[PDB]
Structure formats: C-alpha cells, structure tokens
Design a protein around this ligand. Sequence first.
Ligand SMILES: Cc1cc2c(cc1C)N(S(=O)(=O)O)[C@@H]1C(=O)NC(=O)N=C1N2C[C@H](O)[C@H](O)[C@H](O)COP(=O)(O)OP(=O)(O)OC[C@H]1O[C@@H](n2cnc3c(N)ncnc32)[C@H](O)[C@@H]1O
Ligand SMILES: Cc1cc2c(cc1C)N(S(=O)(=O)O)[C@@H]1C(=O)NC(=O)N=C1N2C[C@H](O)[C@H](O)[C@H](O)COP(=O)(O)OP(=O)(O)OC[C@H]1O[C@@H](n2cnc3c(N)ncnc32)[C@H](O)[C@@H]1O
Ligand code: SF4
Ligand code: SF4
Ligand code: SF4
Ligand code: SF4
Lengths: 642, 642, 149, 149
Amino acid sequence: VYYPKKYELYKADEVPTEVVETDILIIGGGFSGCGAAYEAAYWAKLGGLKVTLVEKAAVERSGAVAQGLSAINTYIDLTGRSERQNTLEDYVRYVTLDMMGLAREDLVADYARHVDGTVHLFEKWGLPIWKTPDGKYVREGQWQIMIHGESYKPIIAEAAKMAVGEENIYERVFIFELLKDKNDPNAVAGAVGFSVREPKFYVFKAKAVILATGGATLLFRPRSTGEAAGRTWYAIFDTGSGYYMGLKAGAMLTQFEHRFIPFRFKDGYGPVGAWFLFFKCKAKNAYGEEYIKTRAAELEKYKPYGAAQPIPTPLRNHQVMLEIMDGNQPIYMHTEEALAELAGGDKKKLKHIYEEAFEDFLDMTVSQALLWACQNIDPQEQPSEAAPAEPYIMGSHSGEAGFWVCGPEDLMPEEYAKLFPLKYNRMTTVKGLFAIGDCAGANPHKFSSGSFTEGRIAAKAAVRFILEQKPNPEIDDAVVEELKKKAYAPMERFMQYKDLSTADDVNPEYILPWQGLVRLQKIMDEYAAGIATIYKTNEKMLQRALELLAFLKEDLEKLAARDLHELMRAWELVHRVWTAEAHVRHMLFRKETRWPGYYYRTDYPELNDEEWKCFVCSKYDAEKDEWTFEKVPYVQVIEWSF
Amino acid sequence: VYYPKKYELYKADEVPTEVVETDILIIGGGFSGCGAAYEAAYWAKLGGLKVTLVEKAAVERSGAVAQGLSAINTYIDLTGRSERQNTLEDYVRYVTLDMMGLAREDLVADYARHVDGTVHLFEKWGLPIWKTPDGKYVREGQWQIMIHGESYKPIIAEAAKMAVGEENIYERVFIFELLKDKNDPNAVAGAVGFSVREPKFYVFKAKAVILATGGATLLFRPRSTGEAAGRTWYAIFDTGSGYYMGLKAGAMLTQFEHRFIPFRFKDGYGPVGAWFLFFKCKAKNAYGEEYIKTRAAELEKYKPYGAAQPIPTPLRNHQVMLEIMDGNQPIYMHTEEALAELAGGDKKKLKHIYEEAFEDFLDMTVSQALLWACQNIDPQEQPSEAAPAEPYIMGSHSGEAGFWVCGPEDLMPEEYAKLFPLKYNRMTTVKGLFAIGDCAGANPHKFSSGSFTEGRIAAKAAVRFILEQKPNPEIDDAVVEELKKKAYAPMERFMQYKDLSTADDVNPEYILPWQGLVRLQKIMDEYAAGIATIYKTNEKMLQRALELLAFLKEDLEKLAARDLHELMRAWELVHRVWTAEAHVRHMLFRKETRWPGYYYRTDYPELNDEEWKCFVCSKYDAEKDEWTFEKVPYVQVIEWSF
Amino acid sequence: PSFVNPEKCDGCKALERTACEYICPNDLMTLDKEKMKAYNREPDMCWECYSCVKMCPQGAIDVRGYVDYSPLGGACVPMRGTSDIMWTVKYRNGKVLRFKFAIRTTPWGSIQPFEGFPEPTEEALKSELLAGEPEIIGTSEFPQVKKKA
Amino acid sequence: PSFVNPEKCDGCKALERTACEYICPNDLMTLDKEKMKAYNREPDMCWECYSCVKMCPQGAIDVRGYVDYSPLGGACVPMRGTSDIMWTVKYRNGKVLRFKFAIRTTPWGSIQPFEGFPEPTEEALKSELLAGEPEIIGTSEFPQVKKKA
Ligand SMILES: Cc1cc2c(cc1C)N(S(=O)(=O)O)[C@@H]1C(=O)NC(=O)N=C1N2C[C@H](O)[C@H](O)[C@H](O)COP(=O)(O)OP(=O)(O)OC[C@H]1O[C@@H](n2cnc3c(N)ncnc32)[C@H](O)[C@@H]1O
Ligand SMILES: Cc1cc2c(cc1C)N(S(=O)(=O)O)[C@@H]1C(=O)NC(=O)N=C1N2C[C@H](O)[C@H](O)[C@H](O)COP(=O)(O)OP(=O)(O)OC[C@H]1O[C@@H](n2cnc3c(N)ncnc32)[C@H](O)[C@@H]1O
Ligand code: SF4
Ligand code: SF4
Ligand code: SF4
Ligand code: SF4
C-alpha cells in the first residue's frame, strides 16, 4: 500500500525530453550490468564507442547485492587457490543435473571457463575473501567460497564507474520500454524511460542494448502480506523489467516455466548455504527426523537425477514439500547442534564460529539477525524454523528463466543456433539486443560472479557486433511520442478521474499500482502454483489464470499514479503482469512435472524424458497479440556421465 | 491498514466518566441482543426493572445481518405453515449428528421448542416470507425458509427499540471489559466502555449482564489480503469481544476448538444454501466430478456420522478438502446446469428462478453479485468457482464455540449442571453473567431466528434471577480507574513515543492496531490450522502458536492509537488475541480429529469416541494467569436413534 | 469498498444527522470537516454491506469492488423504498439487469411489540414460557420434546 | 522497515546530496521539505537492506523489524568504516552482541580497472578471451573443456 504525502503530477506534453545517443546501452546497473559496463569499456576503445549505463536507483547499492553477500557461489578453482579444486566438466554436469537434465551446456561451460578470472579481479579490487591460515580461499560447499562481502556491490560499482566513467552512468532513470529499428522489425534501436527525481523523459538511441535488469519478484503473494510483503527472499528491486521489454520487442523467452522456490530460514529468509554446507547443519521436521534421510527413497523414481550428487535442489525441495503435506512442521535448522558439534567443547572455537555464523547473516540478510534478536533466538541454544518462500522468476540463481540467447562459436552446437539471425554471444533472437544475468535463460548457477562474468561476455560480443555488422538503427519518432504519452498516462488519468470519489484510492475508473499488484499476486498465488496450493497447478487453473490476467492487463490501461515514485511503481506492475503471463503460458505448455519441489502439474505428475527433454521457447508478437511456442531438444554439449 | 486524516487524542484523566445504573445490561445489539432486549422489556415490568442495551455501532444495521439475509435457517414448523413440517426430536438428532456427536441437547431442544414463535413474530412485524400459491412458507432445505430479508435487521431493531425504549439504547459505545463484584470473585457487576464519537468513558453498573457481541472474525489471515481482507464471510464487525471479557471474568468456555470453515462462492463468499438446497445445484471439481459421490467412500470410516443424511457439514468439507489436496481445483458450483434443469425448457420459469437466484445474493451478500458483474459471469451460462474460507469462531451458526451455559430446569441433566453456581437458563459459570447467540457455546444451528430466541430465553431468566436472588454486586472503583487508564493508554502511548520516528506507523516502541492484527492473522494462519496449511496442525505447531501469541500479548501493552476509531480497533485486536489463545489451547487439549473439514490434527488424525466424546471446557484465572481444562462427557438428553 | 461522489454529497448539512456516519456497522464512514463531505476512512475493513449506500438520501455513495479480485466496470445500485427495493446490476461488459424485491409488509415504525399478549405474572415468570407463548408458536399447548429414557 | 529519528536527522545539513534518498535501491527514502527531515515513503516495499542506515552521516536511521513477524525490542546497529564494519545486535531480552568484520582490503576509490592489461586489438576482439585473460584466470592457458563425443 502506498500513501503519498503530496502530489507530483505532470502531463506528457509538459515533460521535457532528453535524447541520449550511445553505441552500447546497458539497462540495469546491478552485477551483470556492471560486468557489462566494465568489459565494454575495455573493447569499446577499438572503435571509440560510447558505452552508457542506465540504472533506476543508485549503482553503489542497487540490486540483489544491496546488503552485500556472504559468499561467492561460483568459483571453479582450476589451480588450487581454494581448499578445493574442481574441473569444468564436473561443473557443467552439476548444473545440468540440478536442472533435472535441462541446461544450455554451451552457455554454462562458457561462463564457467571465464568466472574464476572475474573472482580474482574482485579480490584484487579489495573484496576480502575468507582464507585459511595457509592462505587458501575458504570453501563453503564445493563450488562456493566465503567472503567478507558487506561492500561487495560498492566495490563492483566502483570498478564499473572507473571503467566507463561517471558521465556515462544515468541513475534514478527507470527504463520501461525498448525501441525498435524503424528500418528493421527485428532489430533494437534503443529504449525509453523517465526520471524518478524530476519531470524528464529519456530517449536512448543505441546500436546495441544489453538487458541486465535482474529477475522478477512480487509476482506471487508472499508468506507475509503486511509490511513484510517487502521481505521477499530475492531482490524486491527487480520486477521483470527486462523480461517485459524484451518479450514485447519479440525476443524469445526460454524455460520461463522454471521458477525458483528458495528454502530458507522462515520469515526473514536468512541464507542456509553456509549453515548447510559450511557448518554442517541438519534440517529436521517437528519430530526430529532428518527428512533428507527418511525421504531419500522417494527420489528413486527420479533416476538418474535422484541418484545424483549433490541431489538436485528441486528434489531437495520436494522432500521438504512431502514433509509439509504430511503435516510435520515446523521444519528446523538445528544450529545449536551444529555449533556444539563444530566447537567440540572448545569455548574459544565456539566464539569464533559464532562470529562466523552471525557474519553470514549480517553480510547479506540483516533481517534474519534482526528476527533472531526480536524473537530472542540464540543459535547456540535453540534451533530456527525454516520454510520455502513464494516463487520467484530469474535466470542467474537456481532458476533458469530468461531469454533464449546465443552461445560462443566454439561451444554452441548447430541444434541451438537455428533461431538467431546473428550469431553473437548472449544476443537474443532480436538483432542487437543482448540479455545477461537474470535476463539470460537456460544457463543458471551464475550467481554474483557468474552474472558479472556473463555481462563481460555479452559486452565484448556487443562491441564485436557493432564493429562487424556496423548497425545504424533509426528510432520511430511516432512510436516515441506514443510511448511518452503512455509513460505519464497514469498521472493524467488520476487528474482526470480523481473527482469521482472523495478518496484517492477508492475510484471506479482506475487502479493504483499497489492495488493492481495485490490483484496480480492473488491470481498467481491461487492459480499459478503459488504457496496457496503448496505449489500445485493444472491445466484448468492455469487457463483461469490467463483469463484473470487478461482482465488485469485490460485494467492496466486504467492505471493511475500520484507522483513519480508511484509512476515507476505503475510501470513495474506492468512489467510484472506480462512476466506473469509468460510464466503461466510456459507452465501450461510443458505437459510434465520435471521440477517437483518448484511446482507440480497435478494433471501431468511425472517427469517425461521421452517427450519433454527439451527447452520450451516462446515468442510474443505484439502486432498480432499472439504467443508461439517451440520445443528445442536438449543435446549434451560437454563430456560427462552420471 | 489505517491512515487517519487527523489525530483525535485524549488522556484518561481528561475524559469524563458517565455512570449508568441498570438492572440488566445487554452487550451487543445484534440479533441475539435485540431478542434479549425485546423479551427483557416484557418481564422487567414485574419488578420495575431497568433494561439497558449497549451497541458499538447502530442497532438499525449492526452485526451479521447488516445486508439482510435471504432465508431464516431455523424454522421447525410444528403445525404446517411451511412446505415441510418437522419434529423437535428430529431436529435435535440432526444438530447432534452435524456436530459429529457433540451438542448440548438440553440447550438445542430448548431454543428449538421456542424458535417458531420468534419466526411468527418476525412475519407479523413486517418481514416478507416467500410463500407458495397455497400460502405456505417456501422451504429452502428441510429447516430453512426463504425470506425477502433486505430489511431483516432494521425490522428486528425496530421491535427491540419499541420494546425497551430508545432512551435505554446506547449506540457507538464500545464495551471492552466486564466489572466484577468486589465482594465476590465469581459474580459480575457491570462493564466498562468508551464512546467512539466523543471523549466519554462509560461505567455500567448492573445486576445481570448478557453477552451478545457476536463471534470472532479476522483472527485468521483471509484468502484476500489487500482491500478484500474486509470481505470476511462472517461478520467482520464481530471480533470476539464477548469471548474476551467473559473469559477474563472467569466464565468457562466450551468447544472453543470448534471453528467453522464456510464453503461458499470464491472471493465474494456468496451463499450456497439456496443453490444447494433450493436450486439443487451440483458442486464439481475441475474435471466434472461430483465429489460428494466420488468421495463417498472416505466417509464410511466415520460411524455413524458418515452415513447420516444430510451428511455432517464438516464431512462435506472434508470431501472438498481431499479434492483441493489432490489439486483438482477449481471447484465449481454449476449454476448454469441447475437453472436449466429447474426451468425445464420453460423460458418464463427460467426468468423467475433467475430473479430468485439474484435475490438470494442481493438480499445478503451483494459483493457476490458485484463480483459476477465485474467478472462478466452470467449464472445461466457459466458456473462459478467456490472455495472454503479461512476459519471463524462463533456459536450460533455451524460452529459451536462459546461459553458453557446452563440449560432449562426441565431438560438439563445433572451431568451438565455441576459447574453452575446458580442454575439459570443461559447463565455462564460466573453468577449474573449470561451468554447468547454466538457467545453461547455447545448449542449451534441457531442462526438468525435461533439467536434472537436464545436472547429471549436468557432475558427471561435474567429477570427471574434478579427477582429471585435479588443480586446486588458492587463494582471496585480502584479497578474501574485502572481500566479507565488502560482504555486510553494506546492514545497516551502514541503521544509519548511518536517523536521517535518521522513516520507515525514505523515506531520501535509501539504497534498500531492493524500492525498487531496482521501479526495475529499470520500466526494463526501458519500454526493454528489456517488456510496456509489447508487447515492442518499438530502439537508442535500449536505450541509454537502459543509462544508467538505470548510475544504478541506482551506487545499489546505497547499498542498505540491515533483516534477514537483506532482506539476501538486497538481493543478489538486485544479481544481477538485472547480469543485466538483460547482457540489454540482448546485445539491443543483435544487429542483427536473429530471435525475433519474444519481442522485436522495430523498427530491425532482419527475421531476418538472412546475417550473424547466429551465437551472440552476451560477456565482462565486472571489472578493466577492459568488455564484449566476439564472433560464433560456427552450424554444423550433427547430421545432419538440413528 | 464504498466511496463517496463529491458532486452528490452535501455532508447531510440539511439533516439532523449524517446518514452514512450513523449507519456504518464498522464505523468507517466519517466526515471531512474541511470539504464537509463524507469518505470511507478504512476501506480494507469494509464488508461491502451497502448500508451507507442505501441510506444516503443523495445517492452519493456507491461501491467499487475490492481490487484484490474485482476487474473494473461492475456495479450494483439499489433504490430502497418503504415496501420494496430496486436493484440495477451493471456488468463490466455493459449488460444491465434490473430487479425489484419486497422488503416489508407493514408500515415502518408500526410494530407493537407485545400486541395481544397478556400481562406478565410472577407465576408465569417461573415457567419455560416466553412472551406470547404457547400460542405464538402456533400450538394451543407448549411444545413437548421426548427425553431419552 | 527503516525509520528516521527526528532528533538526529538534520535533513542533511549543507552537504551536496541527501544520503538516504540517494542510496535506497527501492526509492523509499525522501525528504519532507516542510520538516526538513527524511522518512520512508512506502515501508511495505522496504527490503531492510540497511543501505540508508549505513550511509546516514548522523546515524539518524534505524530499522524496526516488520510487524508481521517481529516482536518489539530487537535491533541491529551498524557502524561502517573504511576497512571494516562494526555491528551491535540487541535482543528483545536485553542480550547485547558485538561483532566486527572486514569490508575492504584496499583504499576506497583506488581501483584501476585494467591495471597491467595489454591494449585491446581487433584480432583479440574475435577470440573468446575477455580483458586480462587468460592471465587473470591463473591457469597455464585459456581453460579448455571436453566436448561431448
Ligand atoms: C537477492 C539475493 C541474491 C543472491 C543471494 C541471497 C539473496 C537474498 N545469495 S544465496 O544465499 O542465495 O546463496 C548469494 C550468495 O551468497 N553468493 C553469490 O554469488 N550469489 C548469490 N545471489 C545471487 C546474486 O545476488 C545474483 O545472481 C546477482 O545479483 C544477479 O545479477 P543481476 O541479474 O545483474 O541482477 P541485480 O539484481 O544485481 O541487478 C539488476 C539491476 O537492474 C535494475 N533495474 C531493474 N529494473 C530496471 C529498469 N526497469 N530500469 C533501470 N534499472 C532497472 C536494479 O535496480 C539493479 O541495479
Ligand atoms: C455473517 C453471515 C451470517 C449468516 C449468513 C450469511 C452471512 C454472510 N446466512 S447463511 O448463508 O450462512 O446461511 C444466514 C441465513 O441465510 N439465515 C439465518 O437464519 N442465519 C444466517 N447467518 C447467521 C446469522 O446472521 C447469525 O446466526 C446471527 O446474526 C448471530 O447473532 P449474534 O450472535 O447476536 O451476532 P450479531 O452479529 O448479529 O450481533 C452482534 C452485535 O454485537 C456488537 N458488538 C460486538 N462487539 C461489541 C462490543 N465490544 N461492544 C458493544 N457492541 C459489540 C455488533 O456491533 C452487533 O450489533
Ligand atoms: S449520507 Fe450521503 S450526503 Fe450524507 S454525508 Fe454521507 S455520503 Fe454525504
Ligand atoms: S459498505 Fe457497509 S461496511 Fe462498508 S462503509 Fe458502507 S456501511 Fe460501512
Ligand atoms: S541521510 Fe540522515 S541526516 Fe541526511 S536526510 Fe537522511 S536521515 Fe536525515
Ligand atoms: S533499508 Fe534499504 S530498502 Fe529499506 S529504506 Fe533503507 S535503503 Fe531503502
């Protein structure tokens, strides 16, 4: 709910337009965007190219890494700088198996061979990595390393700022729509946005555009609906902006049905990675049973995925869901037993691991430490409850939803290149438009290091694309003006109909952003496998979701906004609604249940490797208002075995 | 969420006290309260007794019947004025079986032998009852008759007003606590309240007090959490006030674990009584399966409850719950097929029943007709989705939660009289304190007519009590002053700590009513068999609920309020929190699942007629702050066999 | 929830009391002394009971379905009289339905609470009989119910 | 959610920018030109990331746990420096914990993005190598991966 102190209204025609001409436009200054800005600045010199970074907030703390992170989840370690070395083949195998068999190995192997260099740069730039007395990076699990990362984002932001120059970074500018080449219906030409600090409309003309807006949250109703609706596990700041603009432009999406349901400390959603992998904490149901044991047999039907090590995350969730359905909650993270075991009676050792335990929270999700403080929970004395949160849509973490993107020429097989007009690393099916981080699908487990890395990859590819293809996109001024009117329409609608009621938020001719959002969350929660149904859905429910989303989409044409802040909220809602529709259509299309634990199609409860071992890709045609789906069979690109 | 336009703050010491002396004090001007006022006015003449009715809103439309009702759910018909006559023994058997074997038959038979007179008076007073061409009352099902009841409450309010006199009715006065006899720890002496229209503290001194505040809603998080959090199926106006004040006084509660889960049209919660019983509507899952038939086998284990006709409501609920757990939603009410079948090809007949269908909604839950309009749903063309709402606590409807009350001398067996110091009809275990309607437990299926009737019964008994025992309790002025300080404490706390933050609703030293309510709803939803877990709970979850409620109860001492409206909201929250605690403790005590469909104890999934065919009664001792429970075995009072 | 139309609301300043403020069962309707016009002070606590709507003499109050599940466009408008009530249901798609139902068969304020009832007596006070019984029940004798042997 | 202490907030004296308003990733912190003091404009959209808290030069911002699940009394207070950050955690029950963690091993603003890197070339633009590679990876050559036979 939002209650502005005062109005801040503008009519489209009263708003000045600022035109910005650049070569490479990066939308989103988070981890992937900063990686793109950093690398782009390096190669751009070859053609004296201009690189521009636009961010809706402030790059210093914007995005998922705002509070910092307690670990770098992706560090292969090909030389032995950490406590454990790994191979690239084992990593690729790991990711494909976690995806229950479906991952673009050309894309995964690609960011994996580059990621370590990115991590090494981070340390060089000042990021303090946990080290053993011997000087080795401290491992959390097999693929992650612990870090003192409170200033993780500020450090990376400084690197990007030093690389592209502050004069090329536009902050507090919300991008809401892409612009296409007037000369070519399947080519990008820039984007439009507006400032949230003043009345100013932005028109960015560019030769290449890189989507780095992060994923989408608040599509589904959370487990807390009051103030705590703000405590989403994933970045509440990311609202599927990239997904919206890209899909409207005609860029194909992939695996958009693949949402991620995080199992974390209940309510605060503090991290469990360190507790599970580093502290060796056990999770037990209300009766003291370690369900990863009691529910092990139930994974036998998922051969060979269920017999994989580590066990795929969705299957771990499935075990949790079985406990929940049987009514064995609360589920506890036995931190007290873990700390006691690790300390081994050594009081000084206990104090040290105790400090490590709290840092794991204070460096990334302070709310969990605050939750413990408010509820008088001392981890060395009592366990903490844990639970799965509502679904989130992103492609950099354990979820692989995002745009279908091209891979490197040396790894991408012919089977995966068919839909790309131009073969450039991380480019979407729309010429000149790239997608990175959460915006790039089918290659998850990137996390912080991998997302920055993917941005670097796309940035170099973008410079190459510009110098090789030499594009010269022309924006359609007629469309720009239409978009400018649309941009501020909510404010004009508020002024035009507010007199119909004595209450600004109870009007029959418009809905405010928070009202439309509550509605979206209810629809998704109840029909799109949200928490309301313990993540279950079926054809009828999904079809009803589309009907309700249709009503909502029509009502977006009657959105109202009272100030610039709420105008951004209005567009963030618009972005979320289309993201939700795409998610629903994708879930409806795949007639199987490949990721139990993330979602269940009760009408097609089994995993089908005979007919569905394929990536589901879709394209939205704005002109015809039609969605087209295609099945792209998975092919093993890298050598490995179960 | 609440955002007052401006402050309306008062300190206890600056608020004038108005002392009202009366003989009989009725708290709540709803259906049961009006029944009490009406009947008390008749007998009061015998002793020149004064009768006082206090209502927090306005009697004309206050309570559950604010919109009116489409039927009178309880009309036995012992002479044939309706389409179907019934016997009292059949009615008692019907209620006991619906309660899965647990009902105070002395109390049920008592209101049943009186209810028809009440209904006849209602018609005489102007209530239009549906009639056949032959002049017989139109039956909905076996026990209900259809009424044109838009003005049902206004008519009843008029009767009560003509009876007691307007000068004896206090409106817009919220009662928050009872007063006890200074010289008798188990006798009532009056009550305290405050105006919500002006700064005035009320002290009511009475010889007999009758609790008629209605049940409790909003204890559990609803299926809609935005504006629609206001669309509770049951009366949002009833917040368990009677439950709170009575339990604090030491009056014993009974069957407080027995909540009611209403199955209604989804979201709007329109009635299904007419659709099921009158229009012969069918309920089917997403695959066209009529689950009352496909799930018949699951009811066989319940003996003899599962073979009863009609099927007990909790078991009907259980069948749909199984469908929901299997993921076979949406659940549909096939109104289109019901109308087509009833009309039988006659277009004029169709138009008539079509109008009857809409009246069923417009006379009782306009929101459902509005929902249909907003969603373009025409009942003759397409079916509507239905769903069970969140739990509600009340004793007049299908739930029997409330105070343990005495029955009539001629029906109540010695087994049920042990806990009453004085044997007056409907008197609680606290001398001089009566409970009616939703406030009287163990005798459900009263509904509108039965609640008004139970009020009449308690009223006559109250007059008899006064004339026979000549009660003369004395209030404790010290306690009154402490309660006056507590009454306005929230406002004073707001003034004292508001300066700690620049935002009125984000303060570290206090919680506003809506903030404490959001917290309560979440706790109950997640641990006390709310919708979050499909109505399942266990010992561990309930124990955690008590720990969280403990934190909340402590924080109630830090409630803040910005105006009189919010001060009332503050006490309504206090009332719900204690009601919630009693509910949790009751569910925790009963080690069985007697009402699957209303709630499931996963740790005691079976119905236990060997050790749990008893009423569960509890007493809260405020001085010691201890709860005590005891089992009172059920005994069949009325002659009937399965 | 309910909302007030500024153009039709006159703050009941030509009446002895504010109708909407007086009738609301949840104390939501109140006056903005500044504009001298009413408003719903806490819409998420509105039960959409339509009491304020029916009692507003200016017909200035309407209801806009809860945003959680209501697409824009629908409306239910009542016109309450003395013996009946008229309703107009307007669908989002434009369809309009009209209904009319009876609400009372006697004049308002005409109830005589104990009409025909004999005076109460000390003897009667000790019985199970309520006012008007046993005849108001329709029987010459108080209804009997068989107790289990 | 975050909240500003009026007694410590100076609406950011004469500095060039309002810290809290500048840093918030969700655009929640803003100034009330009247009071010249900041506030969170939409607390239910607050991620409790503590960015505003850490950046307020007056330490006038704190966080009060979401009311949905937070009993009153708890607090986490950061004191962020240049090379480390200190935290004080106060429990509802009075318990007080103090920690201190490193946050950076180099001076702020000292990053040289391409330090030691060779200049880019048109030829290099066509390879799979990123800036600094394969040297920064630490391997004897650009990492190779086995393609499925
Ligand atoms: C939210 C969250 C995320 C993680 C974790 C815990 C929590 C609580 N933990 S673990 O415990 O789970 O394990 C991790 C951990 O310890 N270690 C690790 O490496 N990664 C973890 N992640 C993952 C990483 O953080 C993640 O992979 C990367 O940040 C993804 O990068 P990117 O895809 O670039 O998203 P971003 O959020 O950083 O940035 C997006 C930017 O876009 C802006 N933006 C969005 N829409 C925009 C628009 N319309 N116009 C202009 N700007 C617009 C954002 O403001 C932001 O600046
Ligand atoms: C909410 C609801 C209820 C029903 C139904 C549909 C819906 C949507 N439908 S069916 O479709 O389900 O079937 C019914 C139907 O068709 N026919 C029928 O006979 N009964 C139905 N009920 C049941 C009856 O309405 C019910 O049994 C009676 O109203 C119960 O009477 P009572 O127990 O007296 O509660 P009340 O709500 O009427 O009145 C309570 C009063 O107390 C006030 N109050 C509360 N707290 C107070 C305080 N602290 N201080 C001062 N006053 C304070 C209230 O303001 C109100 O005036
Ligand atoms: S009853 Fe109608 S005219 Fe009177 S104050 Fe309310 S809304 Fe305005
Ligand atoms: S609709 Fe009913 S609950 Fe809502 S404001 Fe009007 S009278 Fe009050
Ligand atoms: S940064 Fe601190 S001193 Fe400056 S405006 Fe914000 S709260 Fe006030
Ligand atoms: S805690 Fe973070 S999200 Fe909340 S107001 Fe501060 S900076 Fe913004």
